[PDB]
Amino acid sequence: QLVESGGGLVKPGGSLRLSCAASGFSFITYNMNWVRQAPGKGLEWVSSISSNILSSTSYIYYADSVKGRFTISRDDAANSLFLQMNSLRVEDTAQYYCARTRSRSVRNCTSATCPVDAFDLWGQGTMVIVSSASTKGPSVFPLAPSSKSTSGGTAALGCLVKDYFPEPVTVSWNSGALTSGVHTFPAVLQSSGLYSLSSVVTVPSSSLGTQTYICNVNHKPSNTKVDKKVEP
Amino acid sequence: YSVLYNLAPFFTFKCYGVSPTKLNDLCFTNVYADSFVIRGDEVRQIAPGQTGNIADYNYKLPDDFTGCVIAWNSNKLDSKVSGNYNYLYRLFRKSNLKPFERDISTEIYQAGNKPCNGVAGFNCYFPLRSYSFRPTYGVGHQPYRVVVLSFELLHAPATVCGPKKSTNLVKNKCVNFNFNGLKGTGVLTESNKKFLPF
Amino acid sequence: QCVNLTTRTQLPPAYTNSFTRGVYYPDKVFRSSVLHSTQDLFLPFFSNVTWFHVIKRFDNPVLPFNDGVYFASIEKSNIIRGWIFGTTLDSKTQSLLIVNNATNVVIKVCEFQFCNDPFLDMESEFRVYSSANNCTFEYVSQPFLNFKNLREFVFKNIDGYFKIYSKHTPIDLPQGFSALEPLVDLPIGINITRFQTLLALHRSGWTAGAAAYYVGYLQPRTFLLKYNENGTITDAVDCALDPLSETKCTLKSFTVEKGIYQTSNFRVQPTESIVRFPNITNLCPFDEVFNATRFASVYAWNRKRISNCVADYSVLYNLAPFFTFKCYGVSPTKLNDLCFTNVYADSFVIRGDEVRQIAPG
Amino acid sequence: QTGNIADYNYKLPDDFTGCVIAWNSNKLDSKVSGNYNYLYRLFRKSNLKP
Amino acid sequence: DIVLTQSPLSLPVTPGEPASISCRSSQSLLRSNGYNYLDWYLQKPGQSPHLLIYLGSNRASGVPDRFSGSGSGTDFTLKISRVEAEDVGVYYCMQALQTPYTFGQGTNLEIKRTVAAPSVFIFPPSDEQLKSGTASVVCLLNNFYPREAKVQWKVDNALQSGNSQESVTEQDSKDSTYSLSSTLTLSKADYEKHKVYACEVTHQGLSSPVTKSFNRGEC
Ligand SMILES: *[C@@H]1O[C@H](CO)[C@@H](O)[C@H](O)[C@H]1NC(C)=O
Ligand SMILES: *[C@@H]1O[C@H](CO)[C@@H](O)[C@H](O)[C@H]1NC(C)=O
Ligand SMILES: *[C@@H]1O[C@H](CO)[C@@H](O)[C@H](O)[C@H]1NC(C)=O
Ligand SMILES: *[C@@H]1O[C@H](CO)[C@@H](O)[C@H](O)[C@H]1NC(C)=O
Ligand SMILES: *[C@@H]1O[C@H](CO)[C@@H](O)[C@H](O)[C@H]1NC(C)=O
Ligand SMILES: *[C@@H]1O[C@H](CO)[C@@H](O)[C@H](O)[C@H]1NC(C)=O
Ligand SMILES: *[C@@H]1O[C@H](CO)[C@@H](O)[C@H](O)[C@H]1NC(C)=O
C-alpha cells in the first residue's frame, strides 16, 4: 500500500466504491482484510477475503452488517481489490485501512471460524463523509495583539480562519519567513458540519510598531487566497 | 513448424533430442504443452537428469524424454514499470519431486523440532518465493519464457503428421515407402488376413 | 435434485471365483499363430472377485479406484446404465459421467455435484447430479448394448487414457474364454481415485428385477498370449500364479514335457537400510567467528580460512528469528549435503538498506 | 548444430577434424551510422549442402 | 461476541519505569498447541497503526526488544522497559478466534513528563466579527503539560455548556509540550446582552485555577 483511491461526499442512497492501489509486493498470494475506525475510542473489523491460489473457494467470513449491505470481489490479475456498497444505512466516518494478514497458510478453517495471526500493513488515504455539506470560500479574521502574557515585551497575534470547508487549509506568517512562535491548531467540527481553525504567532512588542505582519491563507479546494494584515 | 520457426525469435535448438531439420516428418503422439517463466540462467536447469533448484522441487525431467525445451527472452511483456511479483516458485519441500507431475500445496514447511499450526513462526518458513522482474535489470534477472514440448512415440495412431500427402498406391512393385514414418521397401499386394477395426 | 433411499437391506458382500476372466489385448498389433509375452495390467487367474446382487436389494457401494478395475455383469433386460468416476464426487473436482440414455450413449466429464444415491428411473427421470459449472470435453458414442446376456467391461487409466473395453456374449460366473477387444481410447488425463456404478429402477415405490454384477482389479503381471491364424486370443498364462504356468511361460510353450527345468530363482528382498552414527561430528567451532564482541569494518574486513574441520549449521542459530536469511545460491538444507571446501567468512556491519548491495551482480 | 545460418547460410559436415576461432570486435566493424553492409540469406526452397 | 476490557486505560506514565496494560477476553482461549491466540496492536495517532507482538510470545516486524508480552490462562499483560518520545500511541488487544472481530476500548497514553506552565490567552471578537452577526471568543493555552485539562467558560459567573469546542495539537518535537485552544461562539443578540466574559482553566500542576476576565468597550 502506497496510495489509496476513493472517498467523497456520497449520499446514503448511492453506491460506494473503495479500492487499494499497490506496488511490488506479495499481494496476489495473501489474504486481504478491511479495517475501519470510529471517531471514538475503539475500532471494529469490517471485511476480509482470501485468495484463489490456496483454495478454489473464497472463504467468505462476514459479520451481520456486511452480509446486510456489503460485498467483495477480487481480480486475480493486478494488485488491487474492489469493495462495493449497494446501500448505506448508517455509516458516518470510516478510515478503511488496507491491513495485510500475516498468514501464508490456511489450516483447520471452515466457513464458520478461521484464526488470524496479525496485521502490519495498515494504510491511510480513504476518508468517506455523508454530511452532505458543500464547500465555500474561507474567511480570515484578524485578532488584535495583547501584552497580557507573562512577558510584557512579547505580544501574541494571529489570523482567525472561520467558515472554511473542508479541513485542509495552509496558514503561514510572512510567506514562511517567520518561523518563531508559529502554531496552527487542527480543525474542529460544529453542529453545522463546518470547520474552525486558530493560528497564532508570538512577536516582540518592540517591533510591533515597525515590523509588518501579514498572514497568508490558502485554500486549495476552494482556490481562494486571502492576505490579511494584523494591526493594533 | 515452418511458420513457427519465424513467428517468434526463439533460440534455435539449444537442446538434445529429435532431429531439428527433419521435424516435418515426425508423427508424434500425446504432447504436453507446459508454459512458465523463469529468472536468469535457470534455462540450463531444465535438462534431462540435471540437478538444481527448479529441476529438484518444481519440475523434474526423467532420464528419457524423447524431446527438449524451447526458450526465448521477453523483457517487455513480463516486466512492468512497477514491481512485477506475479510469479511464485517453490524451493522448500519435505522430499524430492517425482517427474511428470505437479504437486501444488500451500503448506508450512518446518525445520526445527516443534511443529506449527499453519503459522510461519521461528523455524517454520514458506516454500513459495516471488520473482523480481524489472525492465532495468541485467541479464541475470530478465524474465525468460520457456515452453517444454514432449515428443514421445506410442503404439496409438498418430493424430498429427506433416503435410506430405501425395502420390498413390502402386501394386506388385518392389518400391520404397515411408508409411506412418516407418521407412521400408517392398511390394504392395493383398492378403486374406482379417483385420479388426482397432 | 435427488431422493434418499431408506429401503436398502444390510448384506455383506459375497466372493466368487474368476477362473478364466480378465484377459484382453495389451496392444493392437496383429500377430498370428505366435506366442508373445507382454508386461501390462492383468487380472490374476483364480482371483477373488466380489459378488453383488440387486433385486429387494439396492447394492451401490463406493469403492476407491486404486488401480484399473474389471466389470462383469450377468445382465438381463438392460438394468445397468453406466458408472461414475471421480476423486471426491463433488463440484470441487472434475468427475467422469457415464450415462446411457433412452437410445444413445453420451460421455461427459464436468464438476458434477453428485448426490448420495445417484440413480435413474418408460424412462423419463434422471437424478444423478444437480448442475455443472465449467467443463470442456464432451463425447457422443454409439450405443454399446433366465439370463441370456453376459457383458464384460474393463476400465483402465494409463498415461491419462480411459481405455474402456466392451464385450457382449450370449449365455455364478460361467467358465470359459472371451476376448475383450478395445473399443474407445479416450484421452481424459484427469485424476481418478474412486468409482461407483449406476443403476436404473422400475416404477410399478420402486421395483427392481433380478440382476447381478462383478467388480475386479487390474494387477501388473506378465501374461503369455497364444494367437491363432485368425488373429484372436486363445489362452493366457500367468507366471506368478503357480510354478506350472511359470514353467509354461518361461519355456514359451503351452505343453511341458516330462523332466526338470530351471526357470527362475528364489530370493528375499530387504526392507530397510542401516547407517549408524560415527560420532565426532563436532571438530571446529563457529562461535569465535559468529559470536564475538568486536567485528571488522567494511573497508578492512578480516579474512578467515576454515578447513580440516566440520560445518555444523545446527547450533549457530539454525532456527533463526527470520531475519534476511533469504539468498540465492546454495540452500541451507543442502548446505551440509554440499561437499564444499575452504569456506571463507568475512564479517562487517552496515547501515539501513545496504543488505541489497551485498549480492552478486 | 541447427540454426538459421547453419541451415541456409553455411552448414558444417558431420566430420570436421578441427574447430574454429572467433573473437569480438565492436570498433572496426561498427560506424557512427548504421553499418548495414553485411547481409545473410533467410529464405531457401531446400536445404543447403555443407 | 467477545468483549474486551482494558482496566489501565487512563494512567500517567513516566519514563524509566515499566508500565503494564491488560485485556480480558470473555471466551476461554486455552485450546492451543503451544501457540497463545492473542496479540497486541499499537496505533500511532496520525499516520498508521503498527504491530508490536504477533500471535504467541515472540517478536516480529522489527519490534524493539523492550516490548515483551506474556500470558497463559486468565492473565495477559505487556511489559515495557522504558517509554520514550517515540512510544506515543494507543494500544489494543485481540484474540485469534471469533471471526466477527471487535476491538477493545481505546487508551490515551499520556506520558507524564515535566510540568509546563500554561500561558492563558484570550481573544475578544473583532468589530467586523460583530458586524457579521456571529461573535467568537477563544481561550488559548500555550505550552501546557500534562495534556489533560478542564476548560470552561463563565459569562457573568454562569457556566456555559453546549457551545464551547476545544482543539489540541500533537506533541512537539522541540519542547514536547501540548497546546490547547478552546473556541466559544455566540450570536450577536446574545453577545450584546452580556458584558463580562471569562474563561477558566483547571490544571494538575496548578494549585488553584486561573481565570482571565475581560469586558466589552475596549479594543
Ligand atoms: C475371498 O475373500 C474372502 C474374505 O475376504 C474369503 O472368505 C474367501 O475365502 C476368499 N476367496 C478366495 C478364493 O481367496
Ligand atoms: C440422450 O442423451 C442426451 C444427453 O446427451 C439427453 O439430453 C437426451 O434427452 C437423451 N435422449 C432421450 C430420448 O432421453
Ligand atoms: C466456474 O464456474 C463458476 C460458476 O459457479 C464461475 O463463477 C467461475 O468463473 C468459473 N471458472 C472458470 C475458470 O470458468
Ligand atoms: C490424485 O488424487 C490422490 C488422492 O486424492 C492424490 O494422492 C494424488 O496426489 C492426486 N494426483 C495428482 C497428480 O495430483
Ligand atoms: C477363421 O477364418 C476362416 C475364414 O474366414 C473361418 O472359416 C474360420 O471359421 C475362422 N476361425 C474361427 C475360429 O472362427
Ligand atoms: C561417540 O564417539 C566415541 C568415539 O570418540 C564412540 O566410542 C561412541 O560410541 C560414540 N557415541 C555414540 C552414541 O555412538
Ligand atoms: C555468545 O557467547 C556467550 C558466552 O560465550 C553466550 O552467553 C551467548 O548466549 C552467545 N550468543 C549466541 C548468539 O550464541
Numbering used by the authors:
A (entry chain H): 3 to 234
B (entry chain C): 365 to 562
C (entry chain B): 14 to 68, 77 to 142, 153 to 176, 185 to 210, 215 to 247, 257 to 413
D (entry chain A): 414 to 463
E (entry chain L): 1 to 219
From the paper:
SARS-CoV-2 Omicron variants feature highly mutated spike proteins with extraordinary abilities in evading antibodies isolated earlier in the pandemic. Investigation of memory B cells from patients primarily with breakthrough infections with the Delta variant enables isolation of a number of neutralizing antibodies cross-reactive to heterologous variants of concern (VOCs) including Omicron variants (BA.1-BA.4). YB9-258 and YB13-292 demonstrate best cross-neutralization abilities towards VOCs, including the Omicron BA.1 variant. RBD substitutions in Kappa (L452R, E484Q) and Lambda (L452Q, F490S) variants abolish YB13-292 binding. To understand neutralizing activities of cross-neutralizing antibodies identified by our activity assays we determined the cryo-EM structures of the most potent YB9-258 and YB13-292 antibodies in complex with various spikes proteins.
By cryo-EM, we only observed 3:3 spike protomer:YB13-292 Fab complexes, suggesting that excess of YB13-292 Fab is able to saturate all three spike RBDs. Consistent with structural data, substitutions at 452, 484 and 490, all within the epitope, affect YB13-292 binding. Substitutions at 417 and 478, outside of the epitope, have very little effect. Modeling suggested that YB13-292 and ACE2 would not clash when bound to RBD. 47D1 has been shown to neutralize virus by inhibiting spike fusogenic activity without blocking ACE2 binding. With almost the same epitope and binding mode to 47D1, YB13-292 likely neutralizes virus via the same mechanism as 47D1. We found that while the HCDR2 insertions are not essential in neutralization of wildtype virus, addition of the complete 4 amino acid “SNIL” insertion is essential for YB13-292 and YB13-292 like antibodies to fully neutralize Delta and Omicron BA.1 variants. In addition to hydrophobic contacts mediated by the “SNIL” insertion, binding of antibody YB13-292 is strengthened by additional interactions including a hydrogen bond between R104 of HCDR3 and backbone carbonyl oxygen of RBD residue 484, cation-π interaction between R106 of HCDR3 and F490, and further contact near A484 by HCDR3. Together with interactions mediated by the “SNIL” insertion, these additional interactions likely render YB13-292 resistant to escape: single substitutions at 484, 452 and 490 are unable to abolish YB13-292 binding with primarily effects on antigen dissociation, explaining YB13-292’s ability to cross-neutralize Beta, Delta and Omicron BA.1 variants. YB13-292 showed reduced binding to recent Omicron BA.4/BA.5 spike with L452R, while binding by YB9-258 is not affected by recent Omicron variants.
